Design an enzyme around this catalytic site. Structure first.
Site, PDB file in Angstrom:
ATOM      1  N   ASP D  43       0.836  -1.192   0.000  1.00  0.00           N
ATOM      2  CA  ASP D  43       0.000   0.000   0.000  1.00  0.00           C
ATOM      3  C   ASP D  43       0.875   1.248   0.000  1.00  0.00           C
ATOM      4  OD1 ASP D  43      -1.986   1.877   0.193  1.00  0.00           O
ATOM      5  OD2 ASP D  43      -2.686   1.275   2.182  1.00  0.00           O
ATOM      6  N   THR D  76      -5.058   5.251  -4.775  1.00  0.00           N
ATOM      7  CA  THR D  76      -4.183   6.180  -4.065  1.00  0.00           C
ATOM      8  C   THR D  76      -2.892   6.416  -4.841  1.00  0.00           C
ATOM      9  OG1 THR D  76      -5.103   5.518  -1.927  1.00  0.00           O
ATOM     10  CG2 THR D  76      -2.950   6.597  -1.922  1.00  0.00           C
ATOM     11  N   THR D  77      -2.274   5.343  -5.338  1.00  0.00           N
ATOM     12  CA  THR D  77      -1.042   5.470  -6.105  1.00  0.00           C
ATOM     13  C   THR D  77      -1.278   5.989  -7.516  1.00  0.00           C
ATOM     14  OG1 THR D  77      -1.172   3.151  -6.788  1.00  0.00           O
ATOM     15  CG2 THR D  77       0.056   3.650  -4.776  1.00  0.00           C
ATOM     16  N   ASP D 353     -14.411   1.421   2.548  1.00  0.00           N
ATOM     17  CA  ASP D 353     -14.041   1.347   1.140  1.00  0.00           C
ATOM     18  C   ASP D 353     -15.183   0.809   0.289  1.00  0.00           C
ATOM     19  OD1 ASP D 353     -11.574   2.354   1.780  1.00  0.00           O
ATOM     20  OD2 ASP D 353     -10.541   0.417   1.730  1.00  0.00           O
TER      21      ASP D 353
END
Lengths: 523, 512, 507, 485
Positions: D43, D76-77, D353
């Site tokens: 993550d 997120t990335t 989520d």
């Protein structure tokens, strides 16, 4: 190592970025002999510099390929091939092998050379008119000497038209020799007093007592290779001294013989004797009383070009004035050029000459010496006009470069496969030509680039653009805004130069990418 | 150690230039903000040049004066710290070049003081009062460029005349000729019933409320009307008399001559019946926030509880207000109350129109930052055109003024006037414009316009040309909307001059 | 790179900085030590710069424009080098801001086009108006001699300066035709002008004190070979197999020399000039025949004798033709200079002359020798060139003025370039005040006051520090100087700034 | 230009770490701690947080990841790599091409507007009322986790949570609220240890774990009355009833106090027919006032009669999970049951989520394809609009198209195929064919996404390019970095 080789070429690439264009920079060359020279042409700089690195030798050997067959494109092959390696850096870091990069340029080279035949605008009729030669020669004088473009236009075009004979639709008989046009420079004066005369120009002084001949047309000229002296025997015949009684017979003997030999020669009607060797003291006094112009030509190269002009032939012997081998000249006089009086060679409306010489004058020999190299490159530009599609032309000053980019990108989407990455990078590499003219001229690069693409990209009801194909890259130097059309000043590069420079620069760029390692051992 | 001679003169130049390089990129609205990193590792992002100089570490005395220089600028004008540092930085570079010319710095300091006194008189011919208020509007370009980042910027051309025409009506005089615009004026009421084309300008007070009675007419007492603003309701009050407590206050309002009654908590039905025979229009559920601003304009006072000591009454039309006429026009699917022609108002109300409530909130904050820039500059009756017109005009005036001396300072005055060219220079750098073109043409237009000025005869004026960085062309800054008060420019050149003098007065530095 | 262009500019400043004090007649002089160890001191920038031989390539550009300045013009070799490098010094901060050097070089030629048309407007052609033949040369001679030690004695020097140029053709004049020989000792006001050439009195041999000092019409003969029998250095080795033949060979060598001696005796040439020393045999034989002979004649001195009497030198004494001989009007050897010096006077066909100077030291005369050359160059260019302009900073300040107003009318980058071009022209009047010791701050500021009032003739007074007019000071310069200087300085500046790389090959 | 290079280098070095963290097939990163520990999690939030930073541009990218986590649960990335690639493509244009930085900033703002228009054109609508269709959407964040077995039950708990606080209303008068939803305060849930997930129900209201003072009480009342006051119950015997007498004036059915309740007050309130709750936290009383409306008043004599006890379903005190609870069922509280506390902790982050995916579908029916499909679909449209855009901004405008192709090329590098060969082949599929052809993670060859739908909500793609422009332009505006306080 390929990336490291580009960095070494990038240092040489930046040298030519300040060369091409009238706004470019000149580099001073200090020879090891203690002689400081400066020139715009980069091919001369590569000759005085010792080339070592192997990737640099490829561009130098390709530069000598441009020197032959044409006089233009020395800075074109260096900048174009240098940019193809710079745009290839993005493909190397991406992970694409250099093998498919070379194959991509080969497919784009055939598409580029085929389109150049369809991008031609006008065609030279080879009329050899004074006004027609002003269109080809004027842009060649540019990018080398500034301010002399309009002055040297009438001087070069008039001298070339005199060498070129009158013919049409005949390609069998060759013509236009390189040595037929000689350029000499004299210190003092200016370029306004320079004229164009038909004939050779000699810088030697009239040692004979006759300064100038008469105004009668068709004066006979006798070119003698053997020096003036008493006739000897072809077998042995060595003069030896024994007693003082024979000394008086040597001076009195040669006095009557030399006077008798020049007698019968001067009685044949020849008023000009050209001696390719040294002239004796006694033989010079005899020809001066008979009204014979004595002209010594120690250079054997000048006697070869004289045979095709006056018609005289050099004789290895002495004392055989053959009238069939004698030439004809209307006027031979001695004029003062730059303060020195030299005997010239000319003619008026007769005995057409294939050899001419341009007389130049200037106060500073430095810039005047570069004019000779600029005209010699301008003479070689006339060679670009030949029978095999030599009269074809294309608009210059960045007009064809940017216009070709839009046509190459169209072929990229039409060709499937991995070749799309090589075709796109091949068109981007042509942006160095307009940036070179825009950066050296002081204008803002970010202002000129979008104005170029806006002119080359228009919306017209059709697939072929019609009204304006002539938009170029202009050097302004003006106050506010506006540009000029290529057709206005007729500044363009011929197709023979552009097609040859691109074909050589393409192979020279792909050659550097082929060598990934070097090995040096003792021979 | 000890530092003396020409070593300290060149050291102060490198120290001041290194500090000045921070604010060179922040000049003008097109400038770029920079980040301040401390030893803790935190940081901040702001475009204010005053807060940057306060958090900037300066280890040299030449830059320390520039740190305290921003304090004198904030405590007086409060804005312009970025331009003052750039001016003081160029004056040091021009004065340092005069060292090799064997010119003594005292005369250089004296030459700057003489040019500073004459520069004030040169601005008098520049500065002017409010002009172009009839036949055109010079303030329409300020709101157009400020709201250009919002959807309202498309229709801001028609919306610009709403603010400009109302700005002349909101002027007033508080104490001893202040002539200032109220900050709390321009009431905001947002409703969307239709397309934004129906936006109208209301030159008065618009209160959102209803009539609550259909029997009484909507127009009463057109000549004069008294507005009574109240809080506690007239309804029957609880903890048998309970209804008679609020009934006594009803007779006090009727005898006071109040045609319109405003109650925050509403009015009962029994009190409303007595209002019909008296032709008094009552209003229920009034907004308590709008009653405070209306009471100050009409001379009224918000009353939470009606009483004095042991009594209850209206004090015989004391807390009541005054208004010329109250009439309710048909608003096309909107209902409000129009109040116009009060004693002293100097305010108005503008109804916002947009696509949704989110757009109405964005258009509300857009007019807050728009009108603010307009009222802060026009607050002072003396303004000068900005955009580089102040620095460019002084270069032409001081050029001919240098011939008055003709001995020494002539070379110093020429360098002092040419030092002001750094402001337009670095201003066009962050705008992606060439500094050798717009700045060069800036002097040509001002020099040709001042040739026929002293002769008192001219064919065409063609003066006051500034620099427009948005479109990259030469236009008039008066029409462009860039204006700055004179008090800001006088204190800027006065503080920047004294900051450079203190550096030139140091021939020796003692460092322990 | 960009650093190479800046480095080439600073390299020219070091050469320019040395030539700054040499600007002006009262300026400082450069002391150069040649590799031959011969020390020369002069204020003429031509010879100075030619002795530097700087290896740097851009410094050679200043040498090329200096040779053309000395050839076509001959005056102003110092100012043309300072102006050519001044444009590069002011353009140094322009390159740091990102402005390309091409627009800077192009902006210079834009102001030159307006400067050429300005010189024609400032050129006034005047010859016989408010002047005459003698008054023109007399008033202009005292100006160059001002601020010198000869100013008090200049009354006698002007009379000799006027007759110097009148002895030569007015259509073609050359400063090398007037010779100057330094004579140590004696008063400076006792010098005289000579039409012919003089000798150095190098004779160390006995027989002096006997000679007539006045000849009527002597015959001049030049002999290329020496005539001597027994010299004071070498000897003669005679070895024969007979005893009686020793004196015979000695007498034979005397007859071989006497042969060529009596051949001149039959010709009757009273003057004998030879580049080789003459032995004591010929000097003793010529004493009874009243024949004068001069040995060890300099090459440059004998070449002027050919153009004097119209004769020529012959190798032997046998075949000499009668036209090789020559005759002057008078031959007199006086005591001027505390030594007896023989000289020729009254030659009608002489194309050259010699102006003798006297003084307590040879170095003081050298300062007067170079001062007289400045007055000759003014007269040299006043004849052929009829256009005369006001010099001494007058015209220089006018060119800068008008170009400042043209910048306001020209939009674009050319406004700051032309304004910088006019500002760079201020170095010429500045350095003139800094050399003589005048204050550059006050004078340059006080001069710009009246200079804008419409009078274009305001110059700089070289005598007493003040603003004034060079027309009353009689400071004049030809229009060819201002035209050739602006063209040579612009070409030299544009050539160096166009060089981005210095390539030097060793081997 | 030294500060502009450091801004790009610092942003590229941070994005270079997570280049292998993108995708389900993404590689793993091993960080070296000063102690003997190590972190195997891929993550991007837990990796870059434990990495020491120096240049301030690295800290600016860390705050960007924290903002995206509060909005969307995944991707997120994706935002960090996309924001870092834009600065990398503009590096040669800023230095070599000598392009002014504001021109690039103005080009990114113009490209951002056109990028959002292309996404809306390739987006397709979906029915938000279908319960079976929402299961295949959230499933992207379900599978490869322990909750895949409960996915059928997890979707029922996630959808019912976001449907409680949302309000669907619209018209041309009062405007469009655009479906305002607050997950933080309103959807906050409390988990009860022990039990089974099947018995977990979604309750709407405030949950209280406190017991009842008396076992016998009415479980439901027609019109309840709830009073909220923080004053305890005790002598300030008749004075204790006097304080309760003022409360009984409105006849409340529920009495909630913050402190304890004395035994004397329990007998007086027993005959009054009301409920007594003690030890109630003060933080829970603020949430009760939203679902009820009763205002907390110190003194019992100041209690207003305006508030009521309406909207209270049941008083049932029945024991759930061997513990007495209190059920008060724009707010809701879900009671979750699990096999252990570690299982409930995993459901916590998984439920947030899961709701983030279901929420973004409710903001708009438009869905966008993932796995480089949307990334390549925009890059094709950017190249067509580049040739039609005049001005100097055309060159930096093409740099965005190269940045849009970095995301799909990133997944190819981890897939094992040739990133250069598969890029030209995938680009030709969008020009000729449709835009729905993506890249398969399992196989690694170009295939159509029609088989297994990769479509994701547009809100993930909206804020992806949105904040990427604001983060890239923020670093380009800083031309100098100084050290000082």
């Amino acid at each position: 190592q390929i990336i490291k080789s580009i960095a070494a070429i990038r240092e040489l690439h930046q040298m030519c970025l300040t060369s091409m264009g009238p706004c470019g920079r000149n580099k001073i060359i200090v020879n090891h002999l203690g002689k400081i020279i400066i020139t715009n042409d980069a091919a001369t700089m590569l000759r005085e510099l010792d080339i070592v690195h192997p990737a640099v030798k490829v561009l130098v050997m390709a530069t000598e390929q441009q020197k032959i067959d044409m006089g233009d494109g020395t800075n074109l092959v260096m900048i174009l091939a240098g940019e193809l390696l710079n745009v290839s850096e993005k493909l190397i870091s991406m992970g694409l092998s250099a093998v498919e990069i070379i194959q991509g340029y080969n497919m784009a080279r055939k598409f580029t050379l085929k389109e150049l035949d369809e991008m031609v605008v006008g065609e030279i009729t080879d009329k050899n008119d004074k006004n027609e030669l002003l269109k080809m020669i004027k842009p060649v004088i540019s990018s080398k000497k500034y301010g002399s473009e309009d002055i040297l236009s009438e001087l070069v075009s008039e001298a070339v038209s005199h060498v070129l004979p009158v013919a049409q639709q005949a390609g069998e008989i060759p013509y236009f020799n390189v040595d037929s046009i000689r350029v000499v420079k004299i210190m003092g004066g200016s370029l306004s007093n320079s004229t164009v005369i038909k004939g050779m120009v000699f810088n030697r002084e009239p040692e004979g007592h006759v300064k100038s001949l008469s105004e009668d047309k068709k004066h006979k000229v006798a070119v003698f290779t053997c020096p003036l002296d008493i006739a000897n025997t072809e077998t042995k015949g060595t003069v030896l001294l024994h007693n003082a009684q024979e000394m008086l017979d040597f001076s009195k003997g040669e006095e009557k013989q030399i006077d008798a030999m020049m007698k019968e020669i001067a009685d044949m009607g020849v008023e000009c004797i050209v001696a390719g060797a040294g002239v004796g003291e006694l033989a010079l006094h005899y020809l001066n009383r008979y009204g014979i112009l004595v002209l010594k030509v120690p250079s054997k190269f000048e006697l070869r070009r004289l045979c095709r002009v006056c018609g005289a032939t050099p004789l290895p012997r002495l004392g055989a004035p053959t009238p069939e081998e004698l030439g004809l000249v209307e006027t031979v006089k001695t004029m003062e050029i730059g303060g020195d009086r030299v005997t010239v060679f000319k003619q008026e409306q007769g005995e057409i000459s294939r050899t001419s010489t341009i007389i130049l004058r200037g106060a500073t020999q430095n810039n005047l010496d570069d004019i000779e190299r600029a005209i010699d490159d301008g003479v070689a530009a006339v060679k670009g006009l030949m029978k095999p599609s030599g009269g074809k032309l294309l608009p210059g000053a960045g007009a064809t470069e940017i216009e070709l980019i839009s046509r190459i990108t169209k072929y990229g989407e039409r060709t499937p496969g991995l070749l799309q990455l090589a075709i796109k990078q091949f068109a981007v590499a042509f942006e160095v030509v307009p940036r070179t003219l825009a950066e050296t001229a002081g204008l803002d690069v970010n202002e000129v680039l979008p104005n170029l693409y806006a002119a080359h990209n228009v919306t017209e009801p059709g697939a072929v653009k019609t009204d304006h194909l002539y938009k170029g890259v202009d050097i302004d130097g003006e106050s506010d805004e506006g540009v000029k059309d290529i057709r206005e000043e007729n500044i363009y590069d011929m197709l023979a130069t552009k097609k040859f420079a691109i074909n050589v620069a393409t192979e020279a760029a792909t050659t550097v990418l082929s060598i990934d390692q070097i090995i040096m051992a003792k021979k | 150690e000890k530092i003396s001679g020409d070593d300290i003169r060149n050291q102060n130049v490198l120290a001041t230039m290194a500090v000045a390089n921070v604010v060179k990129s922040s000049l003008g609205p097109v400038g770029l903000d920079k980040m301040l990193v401390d030893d803790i590792g935190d940081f901040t992002v702001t475009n204010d040049g005053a807060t940057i100089l306060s958090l900037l570490d300066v280890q040299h005395p030449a830059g320390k004066i520039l740190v305290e220089l921003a304090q004198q600028q904030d405590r007086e004008i409060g804005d312009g710290t970025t331009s003052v540092v750039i001016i003081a930085s160029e004056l040091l570079k021009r004065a340092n070049e005069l060292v090799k010319n064997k010119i003594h710095p005292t005369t250089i300091i004296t030459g700057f003081r003489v040019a500073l006194r004459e520069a004030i008189r040169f601005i008098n011919e520049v500065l002017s009062t409010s002009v172009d208020t009839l036949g055109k509007e010079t303030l329409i370009n300020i709101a157009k460029t400020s709201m250009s980042s919002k959807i309202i910027g498309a229709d801001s051309d028609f919306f610009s005349n709403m603010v400009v025409d109302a700005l002349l009506a909101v002027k007033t005089q508080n104490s001893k000729g202040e002539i200032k615009y109220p900050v709390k004026a321009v009431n905001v009421l947002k409703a969307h019933g239709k397309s934004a084309t129906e936006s109208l300008l209301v030159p008065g007070y618009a209160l959102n409320c209803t009539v609550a009675s259909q029997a009484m007419p909507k127009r009463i007492a057109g000549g004069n009307v008294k507005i009574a603003c109240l809080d506690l309701n007239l309804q029957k009050a609880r903890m048998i008399r309970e209804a008679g407590i609020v009934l006594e206050r009803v007779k006090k309002i009727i005898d006071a001559g109040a045609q319109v009654v405003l109650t925050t908590k509403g009015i009962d039905d029994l009190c409303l019946k007595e209002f019909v025979e008296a032709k008094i229009m009552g209003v229920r559920r009034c907004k308590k926030e709008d009653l405070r601003r209306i009471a100050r304009a009409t001379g009224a006072t918000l009353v939470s509880s009606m009483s004095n000591l042991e009594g209850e009454e209206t004090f015989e039309s004391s807390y009541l207000g005054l208004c010329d006429e109250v009439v309710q026009a048909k608003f096309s699917d909107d209902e409000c109350i129009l109040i116009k022609g009060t004693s002293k108002h100097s305010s108005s109300s503008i109804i916002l129109r947009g696509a949704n409530d989110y757009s109405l909130d964005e258009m509300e904050r857009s007019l807050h930052d728009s009108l603010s820039v307009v009222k802060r500059t026009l607050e002072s009756g003396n303004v000068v055109p900005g955009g580089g017109c102040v620095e460019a005009a002084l270069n032409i005036y001081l050029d001919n003024f240098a011939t008055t001396v003709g001995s020494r300072e002539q070379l110093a005055i020429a360098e002092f006037a040419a030092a002001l060219l750094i402001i337009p220079k670095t201003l066009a750098v962050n705008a992606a414009k060439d500094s050798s073109e717009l700045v060069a043409k800036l002097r040509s237009y001002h020099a040709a316009s001042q040739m026929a000025k002293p002769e008192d005869v001219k064919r065409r004026s063609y003066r006051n040309y500034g620099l427009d960085l948005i479109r990259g062309k030469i236009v008039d800054e008066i029409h462009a909307g860039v204006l700055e008060p004179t008090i800001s420019k006088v204190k800027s050149l006065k503080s920047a001059l004294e900051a450079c003098v203190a550096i030139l007065r140091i021939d020796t530095m003692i460092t322990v | 790179g960009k650093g190479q262009i800046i480095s080439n500019i600073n390299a020219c400043v070091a050469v320019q900085e040395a030539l700054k004090p040499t600007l002006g007649p009262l300026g400082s002089d450069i002391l150069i030590v040649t590799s031959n160890q011969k020390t020369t001191i002069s204020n003429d920038g031509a010879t100075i710069l030619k002795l530097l031989d700087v290896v740097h390539p851009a410094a050679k550009t200043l040498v090329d424009i200096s040779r053309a300045q000395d050839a076509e013009v001959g005056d102003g070799t110092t100012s043309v080098t300072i102006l050519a490098g001044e444009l590069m010094k002011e353009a140094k901060p322009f390159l740091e801001e990102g402005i390309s050097s091409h627009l800077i070089m192009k902006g210079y030629r834009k102001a030159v086009s307006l400067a050429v048309e300005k010189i024609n407007e400032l050129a006034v052609d005047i010859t016989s108006e408010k002047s005459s033949g003698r008054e023109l040369l007399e008033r202009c001679a005292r100006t160059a001699m001002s601020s010198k030690l000869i100013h008090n004695n200049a009354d006698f020097f002007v009379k000799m300066c006027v007759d110097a140029v009148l002895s030569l053709d007015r259509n073609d004049l050359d400063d090398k035709l007037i010779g100057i020989k330094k004579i140590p000792g004696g008063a400076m006001e006792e010098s005289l002008f000579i039409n012919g050439v003089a000798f150095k009195k190098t004779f160390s041999y006995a027989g002096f004190e006997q000679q007539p000092k006045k000849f009527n019409n002597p015959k001049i003969l030049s002999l290329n070979v020496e005539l001597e029998l027994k010299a004071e250095k070498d000897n003669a080795e005679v070895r024969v197999e007979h005893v009686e033949d020793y004196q015979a060979i000695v007498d034979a060598e005397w007859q071989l020399i006497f042969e060529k001696l009596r051949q001149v005796e039959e010709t009757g040439a009273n003057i004998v000039l030879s580049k080789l020393p003459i032995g004591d045999l010929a000097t003793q034989f010529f004493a009874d025949r009243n024949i004068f002979c001069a040995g060890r004649v300099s090459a440059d001195d004998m070449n002027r004798v050919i153009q004097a009497v119209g004769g020529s030198i012959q190798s032997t004494t046998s075949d000499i033709k009668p036209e090789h001989l020559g005759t002057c009007a008078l031959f007199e050897e006086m005591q001027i200079g505390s030594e007896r010096y023989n000289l020729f006077q009254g030659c009608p066909q002489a194309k050259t002359c010699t102006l003798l100077l006297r003084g307590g030291a040879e170095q003081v005369i050298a300062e007067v020798e170079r001062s007289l050359h400045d007055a000759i160059m003014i007269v040299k260019r006043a004849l052929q060139n009829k256009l005369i302009v006001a010099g001494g900073g007058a015209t220089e300040m006018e060119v800068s003025k008008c170009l400042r107003d043209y910048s306001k009318t020209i939009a674009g980058k050319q406004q700051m370039i032309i304004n910088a071009f006019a500002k760079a022209l201020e170095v010429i009047p500045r350095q003139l005040c800094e050399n003589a010791g005048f204050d550059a701050i006050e004078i340059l500021n006080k001069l710009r006051l009246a200079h804008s009032k419409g009078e274009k003739w305001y110059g700089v007074v070289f005598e007493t520090e003040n603003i004034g007019d060079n027309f009353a000071k009689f400071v004049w310069e030809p229009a060819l100087v201002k035209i050739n200087a602006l063209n040579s300085a612009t070409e030299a500046t544009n050539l160096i700034l166009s060089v981005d790389e210095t390539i030097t090959n060793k081997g | 230009r030294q500060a502009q290079i450091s801004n790009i280098t610092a942003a590229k070095a941070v994005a270079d770490v997570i280049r292998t963290c993108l995708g389900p097939k993404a590689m793993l990163k091993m960080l070296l701690d000063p102690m003997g520990g190590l972190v195997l999690t891929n993550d991007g939030h837990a990796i870059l947080r434990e990495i020491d930073v120096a240049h301030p541009a690295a800290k600016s990218m860390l705050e960007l990841s924290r903002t995206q986590d509060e909005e969307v649960g995944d991707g997120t990335t994706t935002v960090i790599i996309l924001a870092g690639e834009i600065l990398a493509q503009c590096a040669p244009y800023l230095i070599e091409k000598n392009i002014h930085p504001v021109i690039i900033i103005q080009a990114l703002k113009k490209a951002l507007t056109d990028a959002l228009e292309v996404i809306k054109q390739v987006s397709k609508p979906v029915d938000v009322e279908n319960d079976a269709a929402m299961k295949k959407l959230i499933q992207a964040s379900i599978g490869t986790k322990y909750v895949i077995h409960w996915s059928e039950k997890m979707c029922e708990l996630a959808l019912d949570a976001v449907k409680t606080v949302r309000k669907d209303l619209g018209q041309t008068v009062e405007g469009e609220p655009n479906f305002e939803i607050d997950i933080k305060r309103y959807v906050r849930v409390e988990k009860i240890p022990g039990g089974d997930v099947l018995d977990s129900r979604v309750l709407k209201g405030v949950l209280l774990n406190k017991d009842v003072v008396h076992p016998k009480m009415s479980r439901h009342i027609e019109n309840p009355r709830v009073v909220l006051l923080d004053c305890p119950l005790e002598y300030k015997e008749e004075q204790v009833q006097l304080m309760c007498e003022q409360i009984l004036a409105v006849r409340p059915t529920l009495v909630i106090t913050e402190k304890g309740v004395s035994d004397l007050a329990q007998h007086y309130l027993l005959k009054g027919g009301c409920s007594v709750l003690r030890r109630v936290k003060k933080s829970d009383n603020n949430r009760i006032a939203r679902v009820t409306g009763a205002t907390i008043v110190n003194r019992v004599e100041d209690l207003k009669e305006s508030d009521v006890g309406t909207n209270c379903g049941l008083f049932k005190v029945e024991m759930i999970g061997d513990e007495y609870f209190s059920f008060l069922d724009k707010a809701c509280t879900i009671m979750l049951r699990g096999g252990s506390k570690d299982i409930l902790n995993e459901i916590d982050r998984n439920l947030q989520d899961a709701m983030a995916v279901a929420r973004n579908v409710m903001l708009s029916p438009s869905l966008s394809p993932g796995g480089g499909a949307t990334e390549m679909a925009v890059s094709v449209k950017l190249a067509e609009k580049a040739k039609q855009l005049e001005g100097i901004q055309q060159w930096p405008y093409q740099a965005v198209a190269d940045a849009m192709e970095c995301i799909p090329r990133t997944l190819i590098q981890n897939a094992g195929g040739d990133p250069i060969r598969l890029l030209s082949q995938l680009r030709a599929k969008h020009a000729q064919g449709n835009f729905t052809t993506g890249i398969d993670g399992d196989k690694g060859k170009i295939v159509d996404m029609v088989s297994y739908g990769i479509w994701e909500p547009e809100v993930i793609k909206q804020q992806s390019v949105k904040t990427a422009i604001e983060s890239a332009c923020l670093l380009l505006r800083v031309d100098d970095i100084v050290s000082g306080v």
